[PDB]
Enzyme design. Sequence first.
Site, PDB file in Angstrom:
ATOM      1  NE  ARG A  11      -0.856   0.899   1.230  1.00  0.00           N
ATOM      2  CZ  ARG A  11       0.301   1.496   1.521  1.00  0.00           C
ATOM      3  NH1 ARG A  11       0.671   2.585   0.875  1.00  0.00           N
ATOM      4  NH2 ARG A  11       1.092   0.989   2.473  1.00  0.00           N
TER       5      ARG A  11
ATOM      6  CG  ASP B  96       3.553   8.193  -4.923  1.00  0.00           C
ATOM      7  OD1 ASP B  96       4.004   7.076  -4.570  1.00  0.00           O
ATOM      8  OD2 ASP B  96       3.036   9.018  -4.117  1.00  0.00           O
TER       9      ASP B  96
HETATM   10  O1  LIG Z   1       3.946   2.835   1.720  1.00  0.00           O
HETATM   11  C1  LIG Z   1       4.315   2.449   2.877  1.00  0.00           C
HETATM   12  O2  LIG Z   1       5.477   2.005   3.094  1.00  0.00           O
HETATM   13  C2  LIG Z   1       3.403   2.508   4.046  1.00  0.00           C
HETATM   14  C3  LIG Z   1       2.353   3.396   4.122  1.00  0.00           C
HETATM   15  C4  LIG Z   1       1.276   3.268   5.205  1.00  0.00           C
HETATM   16  O3  LIG Z   1       0.515   4.475   5.442  1.00  0.00           O
HETATM   17  C5  LIG Z   1       1.912   2.724   6.485  1.00  0.00           C
HETATM   18  O4  LIG Z   1       0.878   2.454   7.436  1.00  0.00           O
HETATM   19  C6  LIG Z   1       2.678   1.422   6.210  1.00  0.00           C
HETATM   20  O5  LIG Z   1       1.890   0.358   5.632  1.00  0.00           O
HETATM   21  C7  LIG Z   1       1.677  -0.848   6.391  1.00  0.00           C
HETATM   22  C8  LIG Z   1       2.817  -1.848   6.150  1.00  0.00           C
HETATM   23  O6  LIG Z   1       4.097  -1.388   6.570  1.00  0.00           O
HETATM   24  C9  LIG Z   1       2.911  -2.146   4.671  1.00  0.00           C
HETATM   25  O7  LIG Z   1       3.981  -3.059   4.495  1.00  0.00           O
HETATM   26  C10 LIG Z   1       1.579  -2.758   4.250  1.00  0.00           C
HETATM   27  O8  LIG Z   1       1.255  -4.023   4.923  1.00  0.00           O
HETATM   28  C11 LIG Z   1       0.399  -4.937   4.229  1.00  0.00           C
HETATM   29  C12 LIG Z   1      -0.899  -5.210   5.024  1.00  0.00           C
HETATM   30  O9  LIG Z   1      -1.606  -3.980   5.314  1.00  0.00           O
HETATM   31  C13 LIG Z   1      -0.562  -5.960   6.335  1.00  0.00           C
HETATM   32  O10 LIG Z   1      -1.758  -6.408   6.991  1.00  0.00           O
HETATM   33  C14 LIG Z   1       0.375  -7.164   6.098  1.00  0.00           C
HETATM   34  O11 LIG Z   1      -0.398  -8.190   5.455  1.00  0.00           O
HETATM   35  O12 LIG Z   1       1.541  -6.805   5.299  1.00  0.00           O
HETATM   36  C15 LIG Z   1       1.214  -6.240   4.028  1.00  0.00           C
HETATM   37  C16 LIG Z   1       2.483  -6.037   3.245  1.00  0.00           C
HETATM   38  O13 LIG Z   1       2.422  -5.294   2.265  1.00  0.00           O
HETATM   39  O14 LIG Z   1       3.544  -6.636   3.558  1.00  0.00           O
HETATM   40  O15 LIG Z   1       0.536  -1.807   4.518  1.00  0.00           O
HETATM   41  C17 LIG Z   1       0.349  -1.430   5.913  1.00  0.00           C
HETATM   42  C18 LIG Z   1      -0.738  -0.367   6.035  1.00  0.00           C
HETATM   43  O16 LIG Z   1      -0.729   0.364   7.057  1.00  0.00           O
HETATM   44  O17 LIG Z   1      -1.597  -0.214   5.122  1.00  0.00           O
HETATM   45  O18 LIG Z   1       3.668   1.612   5.182  1.00  0.00           O
END
Ligand SMILES: O=C(O)C1=C[C@H](O)[C@@H](O)[C@@H](O[C@@H]2[C@H](O)[C@@H](O)[C@@H](O[C@@H]3[C@H](O)[C@@H](O)[C@@H](O)O[C@@H]3C(=O)O)O[C@@H]2C(=O)O)O1
Lengths: 329, 329, 329
Positions: C194, C114
């Site tokens: 985010r 980070d």
């Molecule tokens: O940094 C991480 O690995 C992480 C931190 C979060 O606190 C945890 O909840 C988790 O994040 C999930 C998910 O695993 C991550 O891949 C990402 O997903 C996004 C989006 O939010 C989803 O709706 C889908 O469209 O996939 C996205 C993607 O990046 O592939 O974030 C979620 C989240 O909870 O915010 O991992």
Amino acid sequence: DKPVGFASVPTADLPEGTVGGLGGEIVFVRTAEELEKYTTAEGKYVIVVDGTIVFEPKREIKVLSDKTIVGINDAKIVGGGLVIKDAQNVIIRNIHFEGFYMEDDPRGKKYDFDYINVENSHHIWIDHITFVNGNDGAVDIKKYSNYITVSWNKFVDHDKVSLVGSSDKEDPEQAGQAYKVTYHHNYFKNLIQRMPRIRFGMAHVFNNFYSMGLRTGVSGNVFPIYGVASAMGAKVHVEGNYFMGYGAVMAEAGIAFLPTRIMGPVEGYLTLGEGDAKNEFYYCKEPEVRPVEEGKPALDPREYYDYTLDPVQDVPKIVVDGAGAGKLV
Amino acid sequence: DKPVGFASVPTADLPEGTVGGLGGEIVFVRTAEELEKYTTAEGKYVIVVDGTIVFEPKREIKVLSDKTIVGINDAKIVGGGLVIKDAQNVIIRNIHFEGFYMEDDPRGKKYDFDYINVENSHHIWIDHITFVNGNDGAVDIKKYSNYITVSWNKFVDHDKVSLVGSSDKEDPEQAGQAYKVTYHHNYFKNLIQRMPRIRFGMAHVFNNFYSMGLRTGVSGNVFPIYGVASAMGAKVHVEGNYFMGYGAVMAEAGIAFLPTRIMGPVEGYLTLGEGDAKNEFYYCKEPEVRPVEEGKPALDPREYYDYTLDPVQDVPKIVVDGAGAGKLV
Amino acid sequence: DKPVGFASVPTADLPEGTVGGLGGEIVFVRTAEELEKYTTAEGKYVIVVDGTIVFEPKREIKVLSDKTIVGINDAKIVGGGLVIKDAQNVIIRNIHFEGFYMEDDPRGKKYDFDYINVENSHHIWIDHITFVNGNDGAVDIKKYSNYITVSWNKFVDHDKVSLVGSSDKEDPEQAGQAYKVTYHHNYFKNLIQRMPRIRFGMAHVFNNFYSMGLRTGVSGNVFPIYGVASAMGAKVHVEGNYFMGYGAVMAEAGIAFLPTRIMGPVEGYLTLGEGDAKNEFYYCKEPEVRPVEEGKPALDPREYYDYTLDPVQDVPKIVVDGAGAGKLV
Ligand SMILES: O=C(O)C1=C[C@H](O)[C@@H](O)[C@@H](O[C@@H]2[C@H](O)[C@@H](O)[C@@H](O[C@@H]3[C@H](O)[C@@H](O)[C@@H](O)O[C@@H]3C(=O)O)O[C@@H]2C(=O)O)O1
Ligand SMILES: O=C(O)C1=C[C@H](O)[C@@H](O)[C@@H](O[C@@H]2[C@H](O)[C@@H](O)[C@@H](O[C@@H]3[C@H](O)[C@@H](O)[C@@H](O)O[C@@H]3C(=O)O)O[C@@H]2C(=O)O)O1
Ligand SMILES: O=C(O)C1=C[C@H](O)[C@@H](O)[C@@H](O[C@@H]2[C@H](O)[C@@H](O)[C@@H](O[C@@H]3[C@H](O)[C@@H](O)[C@@H](O)O[C@@H]3C(=O)O)O[C@@H]2C(=O)O)O1
């Protein structure tokens, strides 16, 4: 050396059509102040732009009648544009326009900066220019302007490329008799819309290369929408143009560049070349058409001027090799 | 120093498999003319490319048997490619190929320029090469070529990557016995298709990193379509590869890279590794498979050669760190 | 010179809110070793980063209480990040963070690097920083941290921007009382998700410019997904922000940036400004909202601190002109 298309059409006081400042006084300009001194001067001038000219603050300058603005030594106008207003007989060639992009205005709706803004003017040739990602228009043509050729330019990474006729509310008769514009051998590259978008008038669009990749690095319109549009009863003929959109994955999801578009509120007319005058389309939606009369080209440019059509398959190489600034001798 | 996979397979006259110009005469080349003098010479040569070699006009040169073409000092071949034809025993390593992109031909269908074009040749090792956005193929393998290893290369921003077998109409028996190719530890980066696409033969595709972002700046195919394809009854095994597509938004709209594809008109066969040999797929469609026999790998490369499989989770770092030109000592 | 928002909130031992190393010893640092010597020192320090500081190997360093880390001469921290842990009263300004991108880890899930990682710390001001394409988070705020202002930064080409509260399993009471964060006048540019994503706490998100173009050159998430998310009963108010998504073609295919998102498993709350405090949205999905009580802003930041809201139409230019490193005197 001479324009092809509507800029070449003879009038009483312009017997050879557009000739710019031919016969006038030659001046070299190296600053924005010097350039503006001569574009706003009365009389014939051949204004030779030598190298980079930076406009700070960013701004547009007026250009009067009987001017040639010609670049040498990789001429650049940076953060500046030219407003050709209530004028005639202007030639602009071999300059690279860049620096109107305003990142705080990604849809080009606030600052109103156009690289070339032609207002109530006629007999204008815009040739061998490169335009890179401006703000609003790259070449707009407004307020009953007429007899324009936009040829051999390269337009790159730009959203709203060339608007011809800015108002649905202009005089149907008068506007129907103006806005006669020829766009040929231009390299249109990663652009979004209006190539051209024309209201009312007549557009002959031939032998251009449309290479429609994505506009990256920016927000707003990242994907090319449509090439030529005909609105408010315009008469457009589109022939011998090569269209390449942004690929199989998108096309299979039903997402693809639209080469030609009919727009309203009063629909324009537009026809395609066929046979020896056909266009080619790859990764595109089916072109929109609307003839004035079945089996006739909505515009017959042979009624106004002579031209030769390159075979469409030859257009990409001819246009890549020849289009844009820095290629003229 | 020695190939892994099909290039290493011994024959009567090549007892150690591919060794290139081992034992031959060492020559340094610094121009296209010098390079072509030695690649078309008869006999053993170790041809050391020192720095940038520009081909003007752009063109391909022939390479005969028993050659090593090895780059030093960030060796580049710019606007040139190598046709290895009716030959055997050629090693090409540690060179950066760039400059075949032809913007007037965005689908790579006119000029036919391949960085490496292997025709009716066998025992060829293509290793630690970087290939950047060519015209047609990056590494094509045609006309019953055989015993090829394509390893540790980095392919970047390129559409039609590696075609193995160019014709549905080749001899089913003969072609079924040729086109034995191993692709391993390659870094495939922002590429569109054919990684490889193989007709008839046998392909072992292992421990490669597929990082499928967009191909920007260009028209034509901007989005990656598919990785490995098996056509015309080919026997392909795909194991221990790491696939990363182009993201959640696209995948949620049903738009996503296809890691493995079965193609016709006579369908190929292709199987995946599982367990310790599994691949990983992120932002991808479900891979297409078609075994020769239920529960058996469509190809058993252990019948032809030895190799060690890296755990798939280790593949990205190993491949990024090791793949492409400018990393060999 | 002083923060606006939650970083400015007075406590017993921090009567003026966040002041960093005000009154402390001024030191200039030009190496990673020197920087780490002083960020991990006990006591008041104003640590002036002069020019580029490269971390090899890539790594994060700890920062203790009562520090100001301020860049001059286009200060860069390359391949390094700051972990502010069990600490308070830290100001970080006018530095460009770049070099955490790990191409073997395109989803930022392995290395955990980070640029700024705030753990069980409070009264932290992150201001006039530019962050470019890191690995995992750009600014994460975890383990009951509190009283943070993230203002006037420029975040570019980065996937997972700012996570506030890393666990659904934290103490509902304690976490509900922590994570008070203000995000204002940030330039969020070609980012994926985010902005912030907050669990439990309170987020006031005002006068930021979201310019959501594509993240190119990379695999993984190329398209921006969503801006602000409210999870685990967080209280978020979002007002006076300008959102620009990635264009008409995508929006017409039903693919578009989501400005505000409610997430679970225990849903957060989030409200929008209206009237003089409204946001603007272009090429976006309709924002998700969920008030605590009908007609009330889910958070009333005027209960905690004073601030002035710029009219949303002025936000792009103010933010472009002012945000990011290299603009402070
Ligand atoms: O940094 C991480 O690995 C992480 C931190 C979060 O606190 C945890 O909840 C988790 O994040 C999930 C998910 O695993 C991550 O891949 C990402 O997903 C996004 C989006 O939010 C989803 O709706 C889908 O469209 O996939 C996205 C993607 O990046 O592939 O974030 C979620 C989240 O909870 O915010 O991992
Ligand atoms: O190099 C070629 O021109 C070529 C070589 C192939 O051996 C031949 O089969 C043919 O390729 C076709 C197709 O013409 C070519 O355009 C490409 O198509 C892909 C994809 O496979 C399709 O499913 C579709 O999505 O369009 C794609 C595209 O690139 O537009 O490849 C196929 C193929 O067989 O592999 O041309
Ligand atoms: O420069 C302008 O702001 C402008 C000039 C036009 O003469 C006027 O009609 C108007 O353009 C509209 C629209 O407001 C503008 O945003 C743009 O829309 C395109 C496309 O045409 C639409 O179908 C839709 O897909 O949205 C696009 C977009 O850019 O968001 O152009 C139209 C137009 O008439 O040409 O504004």
